Design a protein around this ligand. Sequence first.
Ligand SMILES: C/C=C/CC/C=C/CC/C=C/CCCCCCC(=O)OC[C@H](COP(=O)(O)OCCN)OC(=O)CCCCCCC/C=C/C/C=C/CCC
Length: 246
Amino acid sequence: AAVQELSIERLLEMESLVADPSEEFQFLRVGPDSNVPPKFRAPVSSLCQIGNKQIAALVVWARDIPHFSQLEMEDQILLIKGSWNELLLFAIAWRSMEFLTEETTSPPQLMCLMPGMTLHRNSALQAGVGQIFDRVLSELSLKMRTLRVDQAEYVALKAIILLNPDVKGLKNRQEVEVLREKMFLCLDEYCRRSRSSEEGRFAALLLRLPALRSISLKSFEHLFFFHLVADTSIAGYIRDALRNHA
Ligand SMILES: C/C=C/CC/C=C/CC/C=C/CCCCCCC(=O)OC[C@H](COP(=O)(O)OCCN)OC(=O)CCCCCCC/C=C/C/C=C/CCC
């Protein structure tokens, strides 16, 4: 490999990589404090495990983002802790585009949690999370299909979501701002070259971020309500996952 650069091409190469499943930690879990009825505990636990695998993959991915490992370790941890939930929802929205009814405001009925696994709207309603389910499919999936967001833009936005200089607690915020600025320049360039006829495309893409942030906060409201998230242990899981060993 050559001195790696933070570029769209490199992020596309990284998106396809599949690393040996790193030992995963319990970010999400059905525990003794979870109000999930016995009859739904096995399936909810299975969903948490699917989530934990995707989070493990996210950690491996972040660690390989050009220059990320150069950041102070405690900052790496904060960036991942602050964006894992947004990144999971963003991926769910991206995968869910294919299940949207052909191009009237009938709510989409299927959410793609992973390949070969869809969550039907009725199950979401039954669990009490129909509102957020609809927000994910309308404010993210539908908007992205309408904007024809492509793979290059999707991976650029993922890097931008991760490299958030506004995360509270960072020791060297300027180092994160610089990386996010590198991505803004990369993305703007891509839009101008690959979609020159679409003025304002770059700005349109960035509008999906505040929506994702709002949806993520609502996601946490639910995870805390059902006691499905290992809040106080997460920083440690990331710390351990980063020094690898899994
Ligand atoms: C961020 C995404 C990461 C990946 C997902 C991992 C998180 C956990 C699972 C999320 C799946 C959505 C709900 C589907 C539940 C399936 C089982 C079911 O129907 O339970 C009904 C039960 C009726 O019980 P009962 O109420 O006692 O009895 C009622 C029977 N009528 O309901 C329950 O047991 C409550 C289940 C609580 C699920 C928490 C939602 C997690 C946060 C949402 C994040 C955004 C994702 C959008 C999903 C739509």
